[PDB]
Structure formats: structure tokens, C-alpha cells
Amino acid sequence: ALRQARKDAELTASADSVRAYLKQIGKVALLNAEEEVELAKRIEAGLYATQKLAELAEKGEKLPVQQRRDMQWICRDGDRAKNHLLEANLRLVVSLAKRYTGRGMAFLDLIQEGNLGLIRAVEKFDYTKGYKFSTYATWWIRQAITRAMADQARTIRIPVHMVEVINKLGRIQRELLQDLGREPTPEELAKEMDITPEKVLEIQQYAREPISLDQTIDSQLGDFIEDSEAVVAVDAVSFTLLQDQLQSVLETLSEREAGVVRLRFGLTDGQPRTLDEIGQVYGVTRERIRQIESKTMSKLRHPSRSQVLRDYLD
Amino acid sequence: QDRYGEYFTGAMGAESIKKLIENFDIDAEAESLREVIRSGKKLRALKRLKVVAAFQQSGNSPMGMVLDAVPVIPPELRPMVQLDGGRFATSDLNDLYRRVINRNNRLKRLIDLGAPEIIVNNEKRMLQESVDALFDNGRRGRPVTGPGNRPLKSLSDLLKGKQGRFRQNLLGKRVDYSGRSVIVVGPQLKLH
Amino acid sequence: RRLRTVGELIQNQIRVGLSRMERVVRERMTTQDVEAITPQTLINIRPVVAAIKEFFGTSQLSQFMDQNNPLSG
Amino acid sequence: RRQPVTVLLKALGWTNENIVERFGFSEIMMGTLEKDTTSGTDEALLDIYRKLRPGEPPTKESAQTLLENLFFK
Amino acid sequence: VNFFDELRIGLATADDIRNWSYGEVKKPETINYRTLKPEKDGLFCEKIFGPTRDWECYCGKYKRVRFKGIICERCGVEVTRAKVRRERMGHIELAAPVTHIWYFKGVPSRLGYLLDLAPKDLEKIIYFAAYVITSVDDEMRHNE
Amino acid sequence: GGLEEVLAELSPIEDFSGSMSLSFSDPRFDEVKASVDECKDKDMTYAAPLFVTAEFINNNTGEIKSQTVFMGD
Amino acid sequence: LTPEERLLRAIFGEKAREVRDTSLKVPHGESGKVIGIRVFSREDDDELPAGVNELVRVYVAQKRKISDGDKLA
Amino acid sequence: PRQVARYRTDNGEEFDVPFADDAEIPGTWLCRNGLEGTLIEGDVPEPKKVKPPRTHWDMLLERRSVEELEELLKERLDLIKAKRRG
Ligand SMILES: [Zn+2]
């Protein structure tokens, strides 16, 4: 009856996402050193055979049909060898990715990124050195997982080199805790790190991580943030009444004096001009306008015009 | 597949579902349903007709039930802003989107290199659940949880519930020109 | 139906902190050098103290002392 | 869900004669022991061990000490 | 205006979603960790969703209201009001389709009743728990 | 004590090979860091340090040595 | 700055400051006398989290007479 | 003060991108459909000189001389040739 129960166990869908992956990865037998060396030679043979035929595509020279059919079978076998080597060492990736969970990366994402490290491990693996594949693949899988965590897990992405200094800052801070029994102040952290104290706080400022606007503490936090760019009614209405007042003040003046002030600050147009630009319209030198600008300003500072605008300082 | 593989075709995932919808006759399925409903008295075949007939009356293709592209909500509705002294706060959608875009791009990288179906299909279902978690989180399996096991808010969570857009920000609102305070007896007041 | 007291409630968090630590120690003792490591090599108390700090705050049992008058306290 | 009453004694390795002594009085479990899927002591292990976990086909030795691991341990 | 008779709903086809979108978000990036700017081709990217500051391109070539409806050649940001960031949508081009989960998982299953497929079996299909026959050749099989 | 009983649960810590073991014992406390008044003023928690004994034993290889460990305030 | 404002800056000769005003103002509907102040500067060692320099707390008190609407029981 | 430019993506679409009349027309533009496209009329300002990515063949060349693979291929090819001869 165990055979029937065994068939029922193989055939189970399972709701959990990581499970279904554990079933399919445990359905390909592992390897021994001899098989690994065998697959390595098949991969290199299929790759070299593929490049030789590629050299023939540009150079022609169609080879005998029996040799041409066998060359393409080597490429067929080379790719099957690559797929077989990966499917066999797909579990090593899983065994390494277990330890890196709880860091903000989902388990499956850690497993897949580890699989990417396994691909480059197989592509760069050398069978002549006589070392087990797990020896060289362990390095590439860990590097792929860690490199992925630095480039992804952070909502505000941080470059690799900045993530590098933060981890060292943390390890230096945890050891100083064990040594001093108290949290090391930045001076001790900057000393141990060979950097300035004002730099470590800035680096510690980067370590800040965002908070979810939807956190509840019943109404959630998002309702407590007021829109900063939202237009205020009083200031918007005051700006209009301020525009109304400037028109009356500027309306009493020389029509050519009023034009200089309008172009200088931009006003109607919106782009503040310069003395030379205003000189081409009124046909005078930039010096003659500065004289006009100074005379109209002293006439504007004079109290009859400015007595009403005092409230508008801010 | 080894033998007989040239007489048929098969696949898995939403790709195969999209193909089954691509070759489909809502009329032939309906007309066959219309004679099967009464002749084979059937109750389950009748309830199935409402969806088959709904697609037949309108002009929308059933292909709309599978997504080849996912729309992205404007930024200001999923804001990321700072409050006190530089610390940041952002909406949950940004990370739900992040899981979708991240897994989609990793799938492109696996396909170009070429990969065993175990890795590609595993990535495809991950993309399937990431899009699911985005639209409705927790509807299928465990919800995507944030720090401290807090389920992320999903697009569907914005509408539903007493806190959704309807009963919270639509059927009721906070208004200006208003106030409150305690009440004391006004025995000397007129009724008005 | 029994009453879990203050001392016992804190005990359960210390237990979680120690259990969260052994996962690091168990993973550390194997792959960390050899023969000379000793507790100084890897004993990370960060998860232990975090269980305490995370309990006194955010926990429903630990509340701000309610004091309008000495009676409420 | 869906668990018989008498599968546990055969799961624990109890000999069949011991059940009659304890459960013989007041009938009950005796009637429950009268209706069962299988009477095999080791067969009950393979029946119950798979019911809970049914994934990754169960090993013979792993299922025996699993209950001691799940409870006695 | 606030005077319109009816509002109609329906399903958005992949083309409808592409027409809504002002661009494809190609990266899971929010803002630069130093300058705090909306890094390009991510979320919040001004190249698509619109400018952060009113009538301002990202690089700052056009800072004034004189020119609107133009796109900065260097930074690729359109010069217009910052309110467009509320109304402008993006899109993601998937490397493989996906079920909506609103029609599949929602009971009764719309895809289930549509294809005469059982929900238990339909879940096996889309999550890669088992295969399915998309097409058979009934004639060629009959000849051989 | 509540600490002593949880340390008894954690003792010992073994690597599953049985070659080495990690034992805890002897919880130690010293005077508090600051008076409660100074704590409520400086926005710092009111705590006292914790000391314990952790012995690293590996007699399969050369035997290791003990140490004095500080869990935290 | 706008064109309209920044015209007054020229007539009144008040240079627009690079800094923006963010102050601490007592909220709507309360008053009293300031009892004391507590200030933590960064120049003085003190203790402060990353990014903060000077921390100041003001304690305001008021003598509340019994008023119409206050709750008695 | 705005002159319009058109582009065509690799799939055959076309998009209108408004620019400043005083500005410089770019050769290629990132279009809202997700792809990039070449200019409408003005043709090929720059090749961009994109370098090809490294391939499994490049990684294998570092660890093997051509003769080594050649010798191994003859060893592998004559192996299957032995089955042909049986
Ligand atoms: Zn620009």
C-alpha cells in the first residue's frame, strides 16, 4: 500500500509557493565527481562545435552531411548537458539561500537570484582543477544572493559601495558594543572606520528606512500628513488683492517709468528682463535705465505709495 | 511528448489559458449550452450560461481576463513623502509594484540566457502571485506581509470596507466650517 | 484559567530572544573558523535585547502608566 | 480532519489484546475498534503518518519516530 | 461640468492599458538616495508621470511658463502643471501573461465557468501545477 | 529564578555532531545605570547590566576555554 | 520668487532669506505661563540620534478654574 | 515656439513628440509604448557604438586554448563515430 501512498505524495499541488519548487528540484538525482566532469566536457564540446559551425556560416564550406548532422547533435547534447548540470545543483542554491531570509527579500526571490549565480557558476566552471563543483559554485551563489539584496531589497535603492560601508559600520558598531558594553558614539565609530565623524552620521542618515503610509495606529498614519503644496485660501485671495493694489500704485507714474519696472521684474510677462534688454525697447543704454530704475525706486519707497503696502511684507 | 508529441500541443500557466481563450466560440459554447440546458435536465450548466452569455452580448473580447500589460497608478496616489527630520513614508503599492517589476525583469534575464523549465516556470508563477498580491492581497494563499507581519494594502483594499474609498471618503467626508463642544441646558432659550 | 504575571510575560520574550540567538550560534559554530573561536567569535545578543525592547513597546500588555491621580495609577 | 479513534493504539504499537482490557468496559471504543480501515500496527503508521503530511512520500523509519518527535519529544 | 448622464464600466484590454499609459516603467526605483530625485524609467519618473515642479523640466533648461506643451530634449520631461502627476498612468510590459485573479479566484470562477474548467483544476493550470492540452490534431492522429 | 529556568532550557547548545557544546549558567546583575529621576529626565530606559557564564567545550579536538558574557542592559 | 513679490523686496530693501521659517508655535485655544525649559545641544555632548543637533522642550502650565461645561461626578 | 518631431519604433508605431523650436532634435527617443524609435526623416546621426555582451564562448576561451577544445572535440566526435561503426 506504500506504493499507492507514494504516488499520492508525488501528485499533490499544494497551496504554498515554495513547496511546489521543492518537489520539482528534488526530482533530479544528484551527481558525483565523475558525472560532473562528464557534463563539463559535453558542455565545452557543444559550445566549441557551435562556434565551428558559426565560422562555417560566414565561410560557407558546407561539410559532409554526416559530419554536419553529428556536429549539430553535439550542440544538442551540449545544451542538454548544461540543463542537466543546473537541474542537478538546483538544491545547493536552495540550501544557501535559506540563511539570507528575513532581510526584506522574499524566500523565492533569494532562491531565484541564487539560481542565476548557479548559471554563471556553470558557465565559468573549470573541470580540469579536480575540485568538486559545489566548491566553486558556493562562491557564485552567495555573491548572486548578496548582490541582489543590495540592488533590490531597499525601497529607496542604495548602490553597492554604500551598502558596503553600512554593513562594515554595523559590524564595527556591534563589536564596539561587545568591547565597551555601551553603544559607541560616532567619534569611536569614525576612528575605527578611518573616516571623519561628520561623515558617519551622514552615512547613518542613509540607513534610515521608509515607513508605510498605511500603518494603523484605528485610522492609519496616511490621514495625518497634510498636503504642503495645497493652496491656502487667505494667501491666494491676498495675492489677488495684492495684484489689485500694485496696479493702482504703478498706474500713477510715467508711462515709460511704469514700463521699465514691469519689464525689469517681468510682471505681466513673468520673465525678469535685464537692463540691456530693456534698452533695446526704449532705445537707451543700460546705464540710462539704471538711472530710471533708481529714480522710480526712490519715488516708490517714498511713503505716499508705500504706506499701503506695509502689510504685505509677509 | 517524445512519442506522439507532433500531433498535439500543451503548456501550463496563463500562457496556455490565453491560448484556450484565443480559440473559443462563445456562440458554439452558448448554442450547445442552450440545447444541453433543457435536454439534459443542467442547473450547473445554467449558472455557467450567465457568464458565457455576458461576453456574447457585449463587444469585449474574453482576452481581457488575461493581462499582457499591467497599468501603473499615478505617483501622487501612491505618495512617497518625508515628515519629521528627513525620515520617509510611502504607500504599500510601491513595494507591491516593486515585486512585480523585479520578478518580470528577472524573467526576461532567464529567458534570454535560456533556462531549464524548472527555473523559468518557477519565475513565471512568482510573477503570477506578485500581480495577484498587487490587485488583491490575501485572496489567494498567505498575503504579502511587511515588517512585523502586517499585510500590505492592495488596490482592492482601497475600495473595500468601512475604510475604503466608498464608506470612508465617498459616502461621508470631513468638511470645513464646522466645530464641536459640550452641550449645556439652555432653559431660557427660544425653541429656534 | 490562570493569570500570566509581569515577570512571566517578560520571561516568554527572553525565551524568544534566546531561541532567536541559537539560530545564529548554531549557524556560526559550524562555519566560523575552528578550534579557537570561543563565545567571542560569534555570540550576537542583538536578537536577545531586541526581544526585550520590542516587547516593552508595541505590546498590548505594556501600556503607558495611566495617572490622573494616585488612584488611577 | 476525518480521524478514527482506534488508529492511535496501533500507531503507538499497542498490542490488540490491551485495547480490550481497558476499552472493553462500557463498549464504546470497542465498537470504534470494531470498525476501522486496517488492523495492522505498522500499517496504521503508514495510514496516519501520510494523512497529516501527505507530501514527499513518507519514509518507513521517518514515520515511526515522527510521532515521538511531534509529541513525546 | 458635472452634468453627464451615464458612466459605463467594462474590461480593459492590453491595448486599452497601453493607450492609457504614458510610458513603461522599466526599473523598481523610487528616488535617488542622495539627491532624492525621481530617478528615470522607474516609479515617479518625470519622463512619464509628469514634472515634480510646476512648468519645470528635470534638468532645468525650461523653468518658466513661457513654453508649455514642449518636452525637454535632454531630460525628456514635458513642461506643464505638476498636477498631471495625479492623472498620468504608466504600464508594465510583461514577459508572460497572467490571470487577473479577480475573475479566476472570485467565486464563482469566471474563467472556470467560461472554459468549463473546474476551479481546482484551473488553479493547477495557471500556477504551473500541471499541464493542459491547448490543441490536438484530430485529423492527422486519425490517419496514423 | 525566571532567568535561571530559561537558561536551564537553553543549556546546553550542541551542534548535532556531539563533539562540542555550549553551556550557560550564573546570571549576574550589577547596580542600576542611573536613578529613575535621571532616566525620566534624559529619556533613557532604567536598566541594570546582565552578566552570565558561557563555557565552550570541545574535547574531540583541543579543549576550549570559558569567558564572561554580557547580554545587555 | 514671483514677479509681484520680489518687487516689494526691492522697495522695502528686505533681502529674501535663503532659509525658510519653521518655528514652534502654541496651538489654537490654549495659554499659560512657561514653567521651565529643557535643552539638549549637540555642541554639549548630551546624547542625540543621527541627524539631530539641538533638542528643546518647553513646559507650559495653567491654573484652570472650574468653568461652565466641565464634567463633575 | 514649438516644433513637433515624429518617431517610429521597431514594431511599426509612430509617436509625436513636441519640442522647442530653438531646440536640438534627438536621433532616438524613448516612446510611451515602452520601446525606442528612430527619427522620422533625419537619418542615423550616430551609431552609438554599443558593445556586445559577453557570451559563454568568451568565458570558455579564457580557460581553453583553441587546440585543447579542438583535440577534445576529435576525442568526443570519434566517440560517437565508434557507435556508428559498432
Ligand atoms: Zn530638462
Side-chain angles (χ1 to χ4, degrees), chain B residues 24 26 48 51-52 55 62 65, chain E residues 109-116:
Chain B
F24 192 84
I26 37 270
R48 160 173 131 77
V51 18
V52 180
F55 284 91
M65 303 174 65
Chain E
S109 179
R110 307 312 183 281
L111 265 183
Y113 281 3
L114 191 280
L115 300 179
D116 262 320

Side-chain angles (χ1 to χ4, degrees), chain E residues 76-141:
Chain E
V77 174
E78 183 188 21
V79 181
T80 178
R81 268 183 171 87
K83 83 167 188 59
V84 300
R85 275 203 149 211
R86 270 175 147 267
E87 309 127 4
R88 294 196 169 182
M89 291 171 45
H91 84 280
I92 311 179
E93 275 293 352
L94 304 165
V98 285
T99 64
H100 201 284
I101 219 219
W102 250 22
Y103 311 132
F104 143 74
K105 186 58 180 180
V107 63
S109 179
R110 307 312 183 281
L111 265 183
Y113 281 3
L114 191 280
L115 300 179
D116 262 320
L117 240 324
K120 271 278 187 56
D121 304 335
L122 195 54
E123 174 169 346
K124 301 177 182 177
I125 301 296
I126 72 180
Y127 287 95
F128 299 82
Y131 290 80
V132 76
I133 303 300
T134 169
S135 82
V136 302
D137 195 10
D138 306 272
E139 174 197 294
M140 207 177 69
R141 148 225 268 173

Side-chain angles (χ1 to χ4, degrees), chain E residues 57-60 72 75:
Chain E
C57 62
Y58 181 73
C59 67
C72 175
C75 76

Side-chain angles (χ1 to χ4, degrees), chain A residues 127-170 172-177 179-228 230-252:
Chain A
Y127 68 97
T128 60
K129 300 184 178 303
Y131 299 116
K132 214 71 178 303
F133 175 75
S134 61
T135 303
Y136 180 72
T138 291
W139 277 86
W140 274 110
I141 295 171
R142 279 192 289 96
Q143 113 81 1
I145 297 178
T146 59
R147 178 57 52 83
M149 299 181 56
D151 289 325
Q152 300 185 2
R154 293 185 148 273
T155 303
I156 297 92
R157 192 185 72 84
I158 299 179
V160 291
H161 60 80
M162 274 293 176
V163 180
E164 184 185 296
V165 306
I166 296 182
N167 286 339
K168 175 147 224 57
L169 231 203
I172 270 58
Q173 190 180 32
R174 280 132 210 172
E175 286 201 3
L176 282 176
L177 205 307
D179 288 333
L180 281 57
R182 47 163 249 273
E183 287 238 309
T185 98
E187 291 73 4
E188 310 167 4
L189 237 48
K191 166 59 170 53
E192 184 81 1
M193 192 166 174
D194 184 76
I195 68 177
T196 139
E198 57 202 329
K199 192 72 173 183
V200 12
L201 265 336
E202 171 189 2
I203 267 54
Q204 287 190 356
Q205 263 197 312
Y206 292 155
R208 282 280 207 180
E209 186 144 2
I211 305 300
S212 182
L213 277 177
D214 301 329
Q215 288 203 16
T216 186
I217 193 64
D218 176 36
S219 293
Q220 28 214 219
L221 177 166
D223 309 311
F224 299 163
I225 271 57
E226 90 170 68
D227 190 17
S228 302
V231 36
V232 176
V234 149
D235 287 29
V237 178
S238 302
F239 200 96
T240 307
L241 303 189
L242 184 280
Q243 288 186 180
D244 299 9
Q245 186 72 328
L246 286 187
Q247 202 92 59
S248 63
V249 172
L250 276 69
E251 223 74 28
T252 72

Side-chain angles (χ1 to χ4, degrees), chain F residues 25-56:
Chain F
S25 176
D26 203 41
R28 294 169 288 178
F29 279 92
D30 293 328
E31 268 228 7
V32 217
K33 203 160 191 172
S35 188
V36 23
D37 293 87
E38 195 162 358
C39 297
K40 224 181 303 178
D41 188 346
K42 283 163 161 287
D43 299 273
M44 56 173 54
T45 140
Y46 173 86
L50 213 197
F51 280 157
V52 274
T53 63
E55 15 242 46
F56 190 110

Side-chain angles (χ1 to χ4, degrees), chain A residues 279-295:
Chain A
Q280 291 175 297
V281 51
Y282 282 110
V284 297
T285 319
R286 44 190 165 98
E287 167 61 17
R288 182 50 195 168
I289 295 176
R290 183 171 62 84
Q291 307 172 5
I292 293 182
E293 180 180 348
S294 295
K295 269 306 159 188

Side-chain angles (χ1 to χ4, degrees), chain A residues 15 17-18 20-21 87 90 106 108-109 112-113 116 152-156 208 210-214, chain B residues 79-80 87-90 92 95 98-99 103 106 110 116 118-119 122-123 125-126 129 140 142 150 153:
Chain A
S17 323
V18 358
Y21 184 75
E87 298 172 347
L90 271 208
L108 291 176
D109 300 283
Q112 289 298 104
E113 279 291 337
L116 276 178
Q152 300 185 2
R154 293 185 148 273
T155 303
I156 297 92
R208 282 280 207 180
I211 305 300
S212 182
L213 277 177
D214 301 329
Chain B
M80 171 176 267
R87 194 172 62 173
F88 266 99
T90 186
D92 295 36
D95 288 270
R98 263 164 43 82
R99 302 171 71 96
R103 295 182 173 180
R106 203 190 301 110
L110 284 169
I118 307 85
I119 313 179
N122 184 33
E123 182 71 26
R125 77 125 50 85
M126 287 166 48
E129 310 196 67
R140 163 90 206 289
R142 56 184 175 181
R150 50 170 257 80
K153 255 51 186 177

